[PDB]
């Protein structure tokens, strides 16, 4: 008996003698007949968008579908574009309550290009979803023969088939000849150990990201404050620092109850609480190792529970 | 005889500026150091005014010294290094240096960094390489150098093309030099400018608001740099507002939030259809430097894209 | 009350108004008076050698001393040269039975040089040895503000103060302002979960390393076989491959009961069992992620339990 | 008209050699490919005889083609690339390529690697850079290129000085070129040699046996490369036996088992007192290439160390 694995597709096909149908995920399965060696695969095309256009409603749709269909399968593989996979994967790492593996996969080369990375990445996502040892590690990304945790994983290069890395705390396991040697699991709470429950949510709190650089304008921060955003994530310089005019808009905003999270445009290392910035004085939250797009994911979900900066900081210390 | 080395400080000391030879006595063995305090700001508050001051200062003082060492906070040091890399016309060593640890803290990195930066500014071999950043025993070009970690002393890396040379026992083995045109091979001349074109940066992510991009278009900004997803792609509502900016007087440069790799021309977005420029390896803060200086010379996106291809 | 931390020194001082004494470790403590903020520190100079001359008898001395003095302290810091720290740290990761933290520290710059990395590295090793959360993670290396596991940790650069990295599975935690956020623990068995017991050993089985390259001579492998070595670790090309003449000497040797372990001169990734080499046919063992110097450490200890290639392979899969 | 490109295979096919244009039809759009099978060996069995054959072949055939692509197994590709980098005197592109995945395996990397290698061999811009290795969309110099992972398609990296250019949509943006002397700027001429000096490699570690080093001294080897601990240091009993070799007719090069960084002269070991040469950034297998070729010209350790300083 092989395990039953569902593939939920969000866009185009990452692999491509069969008749091509109307349905992307049906073509993908025919493209990779070796999947029959390892799994009973059923595909469902949940949505069809470019990853660059990923959004809150696809996240709510995905988490509810995994949580509803948990008992009907032994594991899930999600096909997803590479551009925002690290954001979906963390959203699902916080909101999926299903105890069986959830594995995200993508591809850096077109399925029709020479040396397409899609086929074998899918094969490896299936292996990983089928492995009993994959369970209870949170939501995973499988890319380039490597199992990565949904919180740490990020894209490091604009084109490399090896771009996906857990830049801070390393990967969970490597995949050789259909076998995984797992040597790590994320300590941070995930999945059924988080308080986040998206089951009845129709929308997510509005959270925007502003960038910090030399001579930064305050107009982007001002624009999000004027629209009454619930929160704002600062892509800070070095250890979460802010240009003067940006600092002063987000300081005012935190005083009117905007949640403000200091992250960093620097690609590795933590933005650490009251180091460079008196977070205590301003009502701000330090993101830790979460990059700006990841700190947005957690801040949205934090604002479903609480508006309190001190409560939001303890969430940023435990998830 | 030892080289004459001018230390320009931009903020706090990294070991004030007239005391650095006492603070690092070993400087006395490799150069005649003079110190000037050009400005005093935290690097997180770095601005066009400081850049304009630093370039005019070096360009004017080229004849008075054999080499410059600029002390600078780490947060925006990669921005200032590229601005000077394009605007400096002195072909003596200009070496930027800072410290990841406070001067008064245990195992402070500033003293040896300063020492190594003076070594680099005193080396003949350093001439004609462009503006350099010396951190953690390494010589890096101003175009490719960026900080990779929020706290690590080893943060500064040329993440796409690698370093120019490693420094060992006060000696540099240089094995590389930037091909991109720099200093006196660029047409950017800032001698008479008192302001720089307005260029802002917007972030791409899931469900990104168009409100930042729009805020910059309503302000009449001269340029907008997109920190795109993957290879310079744009969230739908962000793309819509930048497609309108680029037809309306706003040069639009696609860069990436991805910390390594080029945003390539016509690959992910039809740049020709939209009037957009691809940044290549320039991350967004670096793309902002080159876009400001391009817009002192041209608002034509075909000519801005030629500049993005040569510097 | 501050914790009681013992520093065991093996060589010179990594930090240096006090009178300098005869005893290296007494000078080190006076060099770093801030240690009094975090610990009651007692130093013992166990041996005084250069790390390049590290050897089996210092390993047996260190493991027995930690195991004997476990109840007398709350944690151990070992000062050690950088050149072979990654070998000592794994030997001690397999043989220490003490349940309190054991932390190795070193320095890439002379204590007398500008910007000496020693002082603050020692401070951080002490922090890490004093942290209750450090317990049950195996033997650790603390370098450049980073807690690394004794199995994965290796030196990556001949001079960089940041050289120490867990190249395959990432670090265990980062150290900011005297506080560690631990996000990983090694899955591989260590310390009190290994069967290795050095308590009554006077010596270790003889295990040598040979290098593989183009046109490699067999004379180094032959030389270890003639001296009757218990085992030989191959520093293989790519995935553990061997030059012809080296292959043929180690094949013969495994047939006369030499244990042969295929590692790789490649600095990251596993040498994987029957991939490139028919380990089954030759009686050879694949090292996994263990580099040649680390595979030597485990192979020595494997040969205290067993000479059987299949038993040695299961040890290489679990430690 | 398209460039004439000669593919020299050294073993199995990476997509036989006359069929590669059918196996990767898209080659037809960028070059006129001819294929020759020079040798057939696994790269783990690479030897001096193969090296001598490859150098003589390229040097002789320089006038018959516009560019060479050498297909080679990954295990020792960094050794062959540096040997040719020092011995080739053709100043047309010589590009080495291989594959981390079998030709018949899923998502095989060989076809695109081959395609990219031909792009690199066809590019004018590639000339005068030395012998190159193209893997995973990247152009790397033969001196610094090494494999960093036992299985990763992205394994090949210039780990000290970085790549020369990235390949995008069949186009190379070159931003770097090796300063170390290569090809027709080296004095190494292998046209008349039928063997190479005997150089062996020994490993340093805790409690290292002197028996390997001694085995090579008793065989009368011309050279021994130490893979040292840290910055080229030697285990006591290894040091003793190499101190005796260097006074007895055995050139001794200190390198490191550490996968990045230079072994620096006179830093950790008194090289002058002992007759030793420091390898710099050359890892031990690379140091072995340069030591063999140094010993075709000189057994003087002061002159061998000058060679280790220029190539």
PDB file of C-alpha atoms in Angstrom, chain D residues 17-246:
ATOM      1  CA  UNK D  17      29.955  12.927 -28.605  1.00  0.00           C
ATOM      2  CA  UNK D  18      28.822  13.107 -32.304  1.00  0.00           C
ATOM      3  CA  UNK D  19      25.160  12.762 -31.104  1.00  0.00           C
ATOM      4  CA  UNK D  20      25.226  15.739 -28.623  1.00  0.00           C
ATOM      5  CA  UNK D  21      23.688  18.170 -31.234  1.00  0.00           C
ATOM      6  CA  UNK D  22      20.680  15.796 -31.470  1.00  0.00           C
ATOM      7  CA  UNK D  23      20.604  15.300 -27.673  1.00  0.00           C
ATOM      8  CA  UNK D  24      20.547  19.103 -27.148  1.00  0.00           C
ATOM      9  CA  UNK D  25      19.105  20.314 -30.478  1.00  0.00           C
ATOM     10  CA  UNK D  26      19.212  23.964 -29.274  1.00  0.00           C
ATOM     11  CA  UNK D  27      23.117  23.913 -29.660  1.00  0.00           C
ATOM     12  CA  UNK D  28      22.287  24.155 -33.401  1.00  0.00           C
ATOM     13  CA  UNK D  29      21.126  27.824 -32.850  1.00  0.00           C
ATOM     14  CA  UNK D  30      24.411  29.036 -31.216  1.00  0.00           C
ATOM     15  CA  UNK D  31      27.283  27.000 -32.776  1.00  0.00           C
ATOM     16  CA  UNK D  32      28.581  24.518 -35.282  1.00  0.00           C
ATOM     17  CA  UNK D  33      29.528  21.730 -32.880  1.00  0.00           C
ATOM     18  CA  UNK D  34      31.957  18.914 -33.639  1.00  0.00           C
ATOM     19  CA  UNK D  35      32.585  16.209 -30.934  1.00  0.00           C
ATOM     20  CA  UNK D  36      35.800  14.182 -30.242  1.00  0.00           C
ATOM     21  CA  UNK D  37      36.207  11.512 -27.533  1.00  0.00           C
ATOM     22  CA  UNK D  38      39.809  12.242 -26.252  1.00  0.00           C
ATOM     23  CA  UNK D  39      39.690   9.602 -23.475  1.00  0.00           C
ATOM     24  CA  UNK D  40      37.055   7.585 -21.582  1.00  0.00           C
ATOM     25  CA  UNK D  41      37.684   7.398 -17.733  1.00  0.00           C
ATOM     26  CA  UNK D  42      35.674   8.157 -14.575  1.00  0.00           C
ATOM     27  CA  UNK D  43      36.859  11.531 -13.196  1.00  0.00           C
ATOM     28  CA  UNK D  44      37.703   9.755  -9.858  1.00  0.00           C
ATOM     29  CA  UNK D  45      40.536   8.052 -11.975  1.00  0.00           C
ATOM     30  CA  UNK D  46      41.849  11.335 -13.491  1.00  0.00           C
ATOM     31  CA  UNK D  47      45.719  11.137 -13.960  1.00  0.00           C
ATOM     32  CA  UNK D  48      48.825  13.074 -15.306  1.00  0.00           C
ATOM     33  CA  UNK D  49      48.518  11.105 -18.669  1.00  0.00           C
ATOM     34  CA  UNK D  50      45.009  12.495 -19.377  1.00  0.00           C
ATOM     35  CA  UNK D  51      46.149  16.076 -18.458  1.00  0.00           C
ATOM     36  CA  UNK D  52      49.179  15.828 -20.814  1.00  0.00           C
ATOM     37  CA  UNK D  53      46.830  14.517 -23.615  1.00  0.00           C
ATOM     38  CA  UNK D  54      44.245  17.351 -23.098  1.00  0.00           C
ATOM     39  CA  UNK D  55      46.827  20.224 -23.047  1.00  0.00           C
ATOM     40  CA  UNK D  56      48.697  18.886 -26.191  1.00  0.00           C
ATOM     41  CA  UNK D  57      45.323  18.391 -27.999  1.00  0.00           C
ATOM     42  CA  UNK D  58      44.010  21.973 -27.368  1.00  0.00           C
ATOM     43  CA  UNK D  59      47.447  23.590 -28.028  1.00  0.00           C
ATOM     44  CA  UNK D  60      47.746  21.639 -31.432  1.00  0.00           C
ATOM     45  CA  UNK D  61      44.064  22.169 -32.473  1.00  0.00           C
ATOM     46  CA  UNK D  62      43.870  25.923 -31.464  1.00  0.00           C
ATOM     47  CA  UNK D  63      43.917  26.933 -35.191  1.00  0.00           C
ATOM     48  CA  UNK D  64      41.131  24.426 -36.219  1.00  0.00           C
ATOM     49  CA  UNK D  65      38.212  25.879 -34.071  1.00  0.00           C
ATOM     50  CA  UNK D  66      36.902  29.083 -32.390  1.00  0.00           C
ATOM     51  CA  UNK D  67      36.396  27.484 -28.911  1.00  0.00           C
ATOM     52  CA  UNK D  68      36.632  24.295 -26.800  1.00  0.00           C
ATOM     53  CA  UNK D  69      34.113  22.721 -24.376  1.00  0.00           C
ATOM     54  CA  UNK D  70      35.549  19.840 -22.262  1.00  0.00           C
ATOM     55  CA  UNK D  71      33.059  17.348 -20.737  1.00  0.00           C
ATOM     56  CA  UNK D  72      34.464  16.016 -17.480  1.00  0.00           C
ATOM     57  CA  UNK D  73      33.205  14.295 -14.302  1.00  0.00           C
ATOM     58  CA  UNK D  74      32.694  16.561 -11.329  1.00  0.00           C
ATOM     59  CA  UNK D  75      34.955  14.807  -8.701  1.00  0.00           C
ATOM     60  CA  UNK D  76      38.285  16.135 -10.102  1.00  0.00           C
ATOM     61  CA  UNK D  77      37.070  18.762 -12.616  1.00  0.00           C
ATOM     62  CA  UNK D  78      38.643  21.560 -10.410  1.00  0.00           C
ATOM     63  CA  UNK D  79      42.093  19.821 -10.673  1.00  0.00           C
ATOM     64  CA  UNK D  80      41.906  19.415 -14.543  1.00  0.00           C
ATOM     65  CA  UNK D  81      40.634  23.027 -14.936  1.00  0.00           C
ATOM     66  CA  UNK D  82      43.683  24.477 -13.042  1.00  0.00           C
ATOM     67  CA  UNK D  83      46.199  22.080 -14.830  1.00  0.00           C
ATOM     68  CA  UNK D  84      44.883  23.308 -18.225  1.00  0.00           C
ATOM     69  CA  UNK D  85      44.611  26.876 -16.878  1.00  0.00           C
ATOM     70  CA  UNK D  86      48.446  26.776 -16.465  1.00  0.00           C
ATOM     71  CA  UNK D  87      49.445  24.683 -19.479  1.00  0.00           C
ATOM     72  CA  UNK D  88      47.046  25.801 -22.301  1.00  0.00           C
ATOM     73  CA  UNK D  89      48.566  28.358 -24.763  1.00  0.00           C
ATOM     74  CA  UNK D  90      45.447  28.710 -27.048  1.00  0.00           C
ATOM     75  CA  UNK D  91      43.777  32.139 -26.360  1.00  0.00           C
ATOM     76  CA  UNK D  92      40.373  30.918 -27.528  1.00  0.00           C
ATOM     77  CA  UNK D  93      37.753  29.954 -24.806  1.00  0.00           C
ATOM     78  CA  UNK D  94      38.473  26.579 -23.093  1.00  0.00           C
ATOM     79  CA  UNK D  95      35.299  25.767 -21.054  1.00  0.00           C
ATOM     80  CA  UNK D  96      34.971  22.747 -18.778  1.00  0.00           C
ATOM     81  CA  UNK D  97      31.466  21.360 -17.952  1.00  0.00           C
ATOM     82  CA  UNK D  98      29.949  18.307 -16.210  1.00  0.00           C
ATOM     83  CA  UNK D  99      26.742  17.264 -14.430  1.00  0.00           C
ATOM     84  CA  UNK D 100      25.831  16.507 -10.813  1.00  0.00           C
ATOM     85  CA  UNK D 101      22.883  14.287 -11.978  1.00  0.00           C
ATOM     86  CA  UNK D 102      23.014  11.419 -14.491  1.00  0.00           C
ATOM     87  CA  UNK D 103      21.925  12.166 -18.153  1.00  0.00           C
ATOM     88  CA  UNK D 104      19.025   9.607 -17.766  1.00  0.00           C
ATOM     89  CA  UNK D 105      17.857  10.958 -14.362  1.00  0.00           C
ATOM     90  CA  UNK D 106      14.936  13.326 -13.675  1.00  0.00           C
ATOM     91  CA  UNK D 107      15.686  17.040 -14.097  1.00  0.00           C
ATOM     92  CA  UNK D 108      19.226  16.072 -15.391  1.00  0.00           C
ATOM     93  CA  UNK D 109      21.474  19.226 -15.268  1.00  0.00           C
ATOM     94  CA  UNK D 110      23.866  18.146 -18.113  1.00  0.00           C
ATOM     95  CA  UNK D 111      21.781  19.474 -21.127  1.00  0.00           C
ATOM     96  CA  UNK D 112      21.455  23.079 -19.910  1.00  0.00           C
ATOM     97  CA  UNK D 113      25.078  23.032 -18.477  1.00  0.00           C
ATOM     98  CA  UNK D 114      26.359  21.855 -21.944  1.00  0.00           C
ATOM     99  CA  UNK D 115      24.226  24.579 -23.615  1.00  0.00           C
ATOM    100  CA  UNK D 116      25.558  27.258 -21.264  1.00  0.00           C
ATOM    101  CA  UNK D 117      29.180  25.964 -21.754  1.00  0.00           C
ATOM    102  CA  UNK D 118      28.867  26.281 -25.511  1.00  0.00           C
ATOM    103  CA  UNK D 119      27.427  29.812 -24.972  1.00  0.00           C
ATOM    104  CA  UNK D 120      30.507  30.598 -22.927  1.00  0.00           C
ATOM    105  CA  UNK D 121      32.947  29.004 -25.440  1.00  0.00           C
ATOM    106  CA  UNK D 122      31.181  31.029 -28.304  1.00  0.00           C
ATOM    107  CA  UNK D 123      31.381  34.393 -26.535  1.00  0.00           C
ATOM    108  CA  UNK D 124      34.232  36.711 -27.742  1.00  0.00           C
ATOM    109  CA  UNK D 125      34.187  38.189 -24.225  1.00  0.00           C
ATOM    110  CA  UNK D 126      35.293  34.858 -22.794  1.00  0.00           C
ATOM    111  CA  UNK D 127      38.715  35.114 -24.517  1.00  0.00           C
ATOM    112  CA  UNK D 128      41.848  35.877 -22.376  1.00  0.00           C
ATOM    113  CA  UNK D 129      40.174  34.950 -19.032  1.00  0.00           C
ATOM    114  CA  UNK D 130      41.975  31.671 -18.615  1.00  0.00           C
ATOM    115  CA  UNK D 131      40.484  28.182 -18.553  1.00  0.00           C
ATOM    116  CA  UNK D 132      36.866  28.383 -17.276  1.00  0.00           C
ATOM    117  CA  UNK D 133      34.344  26.012 -15.607  1.00  0.00           C
ATOM    118  CA  UNK D 134      30.618  26.757 -16.458  1.00  0.00           C
ATOM    119  CA  UNK D 135      28.209  25.098 -13.998  1.00  0.00           C
ATOM    120  CA  UNK D 136      24.754  26.140 -12.902  1.00  0.00           C
ATOM    121  CA  UNK D 137      24.353  29.324 -15.011  1.00  0.00           C
ATOM    122  CA  UNK D 138      27.783  30.652 -13.902  1.00  0.00           C
ATOM    123  CA  UNK D 139      31.249  31.278 -15.392  1.00  0.00           C
ATOM    124  CA  UNK D 140      34.106  30.521 -12.959  1.00  0.00           C
ATOM    125  CA  UNK D 141      37.868  30.717 -13.279  1.00  0.00           C
ATOM    126  CA  UNK D 142      39.866  27.482 -13.284  1.00  0.00           C
ATOM    127  CA  UNK D 143      42.221  28.638 -10.379  1.00  0.00           C
ATOM    128  CA  UNK D 144      39.549  29.415  -7.660  1.00  0.00           C
ATOM    129  CA  UNK D 145      36.683  27.023  -8.778  1.00  0.00           C
ATOM    130  CA  UNK D 146      36.006  24.029  -6.448  1.00  0.00           C
ATOM    131  CA  UNK D 147      33.058  21.778  -5.569  1.00  0.00           C
ATOM    132  CA  UNK D 148      31.413  22.726  -2.229  1.00  0.00           C
ATOM    133  CA  UNK D 149      28.807  19.926  -1.860  1.00  0.00           C
ATOM    134  CA  UNK D 150      28.817  16.134  -2.444  1.00  0.00           C
ATOM    135  CA  UNK D 151      25.431  16.172  -4.489  1.00  0.00           C
ATOM    136  CA  UNK D 152      24.175  19.756  -5.101  1.00  0.00           C
ATOM    137  CA  UNK D 153      23.712  20.892  -8.757  1.00  0.00           C
ATOM    138  CA  UNK D 154      24.922  24.333  -7.468  1.00  0.00           C
ATOM    139  CA  UNK D 155      28.147  22.802  -6.007  1.00  0.00           C
ATOM    140  CA  UNK D 156      30.752  24.692  -8.183  1.00  0.00           C
ATOM    141  CA  UNK D 157      31.775  28.018  -6.641  1.00  0.00           C
ATOM    142  CA  UNK D 158      34.843  30.262  -6.742  1.00  0.00           C
ATOM    143  CA  UNK D 159      34.839  30.241  -2.914  1.00  0.00           C
ATOM    144  CA  UNK D 160      37.609  32.911  -2.364  1.00  0.00           C
ATOM    145  CA  UNK D 161      37.245  35.532  -5.243  1.00  0.00           C
ATOM    146  CA  UNK D 162      33.837  34.818  -6.743  1.00  0.00           C
ATOM    147  CA  UNK D 163      32.567  34.084 -10.290  1.00  0.00           C
ATOM    148  CA  UNK D 164      33.437  35.957 -13.502  1.00  0.00           C
ATOM    149  CA  UNK D 165      29.900  36.368 -14.829  1.00  0.00           C
ATOM    150  CA  UNK D 166      26.390  34.953 -14.687  1.00  0.00           C
ATOM    151  CA  UNK D 167      24.696  33.573 -17.846  1.00  0.00           C
ATOM    152  CA  UNK D 168      21.099  34.694 -18.443  1.00  0.00           C
ATOM    153  CA  UNK D 169      19.000  33.817 -21.569  1.00  0.00           C
ATOM    154  CA  UNK D 170      22.275  32.767 -23.395  1.00  0.00           C
ATOM    155  CA  UNK D 171      24.115  36.123 -22.597  1.00  0.00           C
ATOM    156  CA  UNK D 172      27.084  36.661 -20.196  1.00  0.00           C
ATOM    157  CA  UNK D 173      27.548  39.825 -18.068  1.00  0.00           C
ATOM    158  CA  UNK D 174      31.285  39.515 -17.194  1.00  0.00           C
ATOM    159  CA  UNK D 175      32.275  41.798 -14.231  1.00  0.00           C
ATOM    160  CA  UNK D 176      35.597  40.070 -13.217  1.00  0.00           C
ATOM    161  CA  UNK D 177      38.660  38.356 -14.648  1.00  0.00           C
ATOM    162  CA  UNK D 178      41.489  36.458 -12.776  1.00  0.00           C
ATOM    163  CA  UNK D 179      44.579  38.663 -11.941  1.00  0.00           C
ATOM    164  CA  UNK D 180      46.761  35.524 -11.391  1.00  0.00           C
ATOM    165  CA  UNK D 181      48.758  34.715 -14.560  1.00  0.00           C
ATOM    166  CA  UNK D 182      47.306  31.964 -16.737  1.00  0.00           C
ATOM    167  CA  UNK D 183      47.663  30.175 -20.132  1.00  0.00           C
ATOM    168  CA  UNK D 184      50.148  32.037 -22.417  1.00  0.00           C
ATOM    169  CA  UNK D 185      51.441  34.174 -19.481  1.00  0.00           C
ATOM    170  CA  UNK D 186      52.880  31.139 -17.588  1.00  0.00           C
ATOM    171  CA  UNK D 187      56.284  29.614 -18.323  1.00  0.00           C
ATOM    172  CA  UNK D 188      54.882  26.062 -18.013  1.00  0.00           C
ATOM    173  CA  UNK D 189      55.251  24.373 -21.442  1.00  0.00           C
ATOM    174  CA  UNK D 190      54.116  20.693 -21.546  1.00  0.00           C
ATOM    175  CA  UNK D 191      54.488  20.137 -25.412  1.00  0.00           C
ATOM    176  CA  UNK D 192      57.507  17.683 -24.983  1.00  0.00           C
ATOM    177  CA  UNK D 193      56.789  16.144 -21.481  1.00  0.00           C
ATOM    178  CA  UNK D 194      55.504  12.497 -21.221  1.00  0.00           C
ATOM    179  CA  UNK D 195      55.379  12.409 -17.364  1.00  0.00           C
ATOM    180  CA  UNK D 196      54.965  14.911 -14.512  1.00  0.00           C
ATOM    181  CA  UNK D 197      56.990  15.155 -11.316  1.00  0.00           C
ATOM    182  CA  UNK D 198      55.672  12.953  -8.529  1.00  0.00           C
ATOM    183  CA  UNK D 199      53.650  15.069  -6.008  1.00  0.00           C
ATOM    184  CA  UNK D 200      51.604  13.391  -3.204  1.00  0.00           C
ATOM    185  CA  UNK D 201      49.076  14.839  -0.629  1.00  0.00           C
ATOM    186  CA  UNK D 202      49.020  14.114   3.174  1.00  0.00           C
ATOM    187  CA  UNK D 203      46.187  15.047   5.661  1.00  0.00           C
ATOM    188  CA  UNK D 204      46.644  16.733   9.115  1.00  0.00           C
ATOM    189  CA  UNK D 205      44.345  15.891  12.045  1.00  0.00           C
ATOM    190  CA  UNK D 206      44.588  14.975  15.743  1.00  0.00           C
ATOM    191  CA  UNK D 207      47.258  12.321  16.410  1.00  0.00           C
ATOM    192  CA  UNK D 208      48.061  12.133  12.621  1.00  0.00           C
ATOM    193  CA  UNK D 209      50.451   9.306  11.678  1.00  0.00           C
ATOM    194  CA  UNK D 210      53.773  10.311  10.011  1.00  0.00           C
ATOM    195  CA  UNK D 211      53.474   7.054   8.004  1.00  0.00           C
ATOM    196  CA  UNK D 212      51.804   8.616   4.893  1.00  0.00           C
ATOM    197  CA  UNK D 213      54.349  11.447   4.666  1.00  0.00           C
ATOM    198  CA  UNK D 214      57.205   8.897   5.225  1.00  0.00           C
ATOM    199  CA  UNK D 215      55.825   6.517   2.560  1.00  0.00           C
ATOM    200  CA  UNK D 216      56.142   9.365  -0.012  1.00  0.00           C
ATOM    201  CA  UNK D 217      59.731  10.329   1.202  1.00  0.00           C
ATOM    202  CA  UNK D 218      60.915   6.635   0.999  1.00  0.00           C
ATOM    203  CA  UNK D 219      59.421   6.548  -2.611  1.00  0.00           C
ATOM    204  CA  UNK D 220      61.584   9.572  -3.500  1.00  0.00           C
ATOM    205  CA  UNK D 221      58.535  11.762  -4.390  1.00  0.00           C
ATOM    206  CA  UNK D 222      59.514  15.112  -5.899  1.00  0.00           C
ATOM    207  CA  UNK D 223      56.957  17.053  -3.830  1.00  0.00           C
ATOM    208  CA  UNK D 224      54.579  16.653  -0.868  1.00  0.00           C
ATOM    209  CA  UNK D 225      51.493  18.923  -0.302  1.00  0.00           C
ATOM    210  CA  UNK D 226      50.352  19.032   3.321  1.00  0.00           C
ATOM    211  CA  UNK D 227      46.598  19.512   3.892  1.00  0.00           C
ATOM    212  CA  UNK D 228      47.266  21.347   7.144  1.00  0.00           C
ATOM    213  CA  UNK D 229      45.064  22.299  10.112  1.00  0.00           C
ATOM    214  CA  UNK D 230      43.897  25.971  10.221  1.00  0.00           C
ATOM    215  CA  UNK D 231      46.431  28.229   8.387  1.00  0.00           C
ATOM    216  CA  UNK D 232      48.671  25.386   7.086  1.00  0.00           C
ATOM    217  CA  UNK D 233      49.829  24.046  10.503  1.00  0.00           C
ATOM    218  CA  UNK D 234      51.203  20.490  10.808  1.00  0.00           C
ATOM    219  CA  UNK D 235      50.728  17.751  13.423  1.00  0.00           C
ATOM    220  CA  UNK D 236      54.104  17.372  15.291  1.00  0.00           C
ATOM    221  CA  UNK D 237      55.107  13.948  13.793  1.00  0.00           C
ATOM    222  CA  UNK D 238      53.986  15.068  10.261  1.00  0.00           C
ATOM    223  CA  UNK D 239      56.051  18.340  10.658  1.00  0.00           C
ATOM    224  CA  UNK D 240      59.148  16.315  11.710  1.00  0.00           C
ATOM    225  CA  UNK D 241      59.021  14.059   8.599  1.00  0.00           C
ATOM    226  CA  UNK D 242      58.351  17.079   6.220  1.00  0.00           C
ATOM    227  CA  UNK D 243      61.192  19.102   7.839  1.00  0.00           C
ATOM    228  CA  UNK D 244      63.468  16.095   6.815  1.00  0.00           C
ATOM    229  CA  UNK D 245      61.940  15.766   3.260  1.00  0.00           C
ATOM    230  CA  UNK D 246      62.530  19.547   2.482  1.00  0.00           C
TER     231      UNK D 246
END
